[PDB]
Amino acid sequence: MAVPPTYADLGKSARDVFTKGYGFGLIKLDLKTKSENGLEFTSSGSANTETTKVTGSLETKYRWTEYGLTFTEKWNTDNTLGTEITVEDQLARGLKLTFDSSFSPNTGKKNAKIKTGYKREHINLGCDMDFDIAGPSIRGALVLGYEGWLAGYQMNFETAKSRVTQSNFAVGYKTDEFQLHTNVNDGTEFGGSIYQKVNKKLETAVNLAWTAGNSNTRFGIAAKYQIDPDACFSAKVNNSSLIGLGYTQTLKPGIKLTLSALLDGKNVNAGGHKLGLGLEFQA
């Protein structure tokens, strides 16, 4: 409805046209399993193309619908363990408390955090408490919204340094089929995204980002046209002539196949082009 999204989720539809539906240089085979209403199992097997690094993950997710509890745990072949607990709507008027934790061998990740969010008709507030060993920090999210107009501010205060290390503003406007968003980070990093839905299934997205002094200019355009109710086709170009193609097709009620390819328009002949494959079985 009119509930404003989180600061990290505004301008998401334009971002999903660029990201969703593309698998580059990866052989992704996932299997989803929902045996009961709450329990969900998901094991994935990916193989890198450039480095030939096979990575297999195992995720167990259970949902407690009555008490609002939500448990999420992830496992990986690299022993990169992650756990998340989400309590939603336990307190009055749409509250949510989340406990995240990620552990990794030798990479130096022993981080865990406590997230806190508040939602209403026009206000969306977020509070994070990262416990990184290098230094704890508090993240504050504030999003204003009324009549399709959005306004957001994000702040991260690092207690180890006793100062705010990042302060991001965001102003945007969105409709049912049109979304315009503007982002400025630390006064020097700027950005903007325009989401447009042309037809019943034609999503048009334009992304623009640059730094202070007309530097690091990066712009592009993406599209997500479907030809069939079961087939999705995606294409995107940027100023570096990187052309990304993607074709998503579900072959049967529980099988999904995704073909994708990245082409370097600068050097077509041996320019480091990438092919990707994605199989998602439903069970």
Point out the annotated binding site for NAD(+).
Answer: 242-244, 260-264
Are the beta carbons of 72 and 87 closer than 8 angstroms? no
Tokens at residue 20, please?
């969703």
Give 8 or 198: the residue with its C-beta nearer to ligand CCCCC. 198
Only segment of 75-83, 97-105, 215-223, 272-280 that touches ligand CCCCCCCC (CB under 6 A): 215-223
CB of 81 to ligand CCCCCC, least distance (A): 34
Tokens at residue 272, please?
């480091």
Closest CA to 21 of 254, 205, 148, 209: 205
User: How far is the C-alpha of 181 from the C-alpha of 206, rounded, in Å?
Assistant: 11
Where are the extended beta strands (E) located within 12-109?
A: 26-33, 40-48, 54-63, 69-76, 81-88, 95-103
Cα Rg of the chain, angstroms: 21
Residues 192-251 touching its own copies, rule: CB under 8 A, are: 214-215, 217
CB of 168 to ligand CCCCC, least distance (A): 10
CB of 44 to ligand CCCCCCCC, least distance (A): 36
CA angle 4, 10, 11 (to 5 degrees): 135
# of chain residues touching its own copies (CB under 8 A): 3
Convert residues 112-151 into a mask of x (bound to ligand CCCCCC by CB under 6 A) and - (unbound): -----------x-x--------------------------
Tokens at residue 280, please?
């998602």
CB of 206 to ligand CCCCCCCC, least distance (A): 7
Binding site for ligand CCCCCC (CB under 6 A): 123, 125
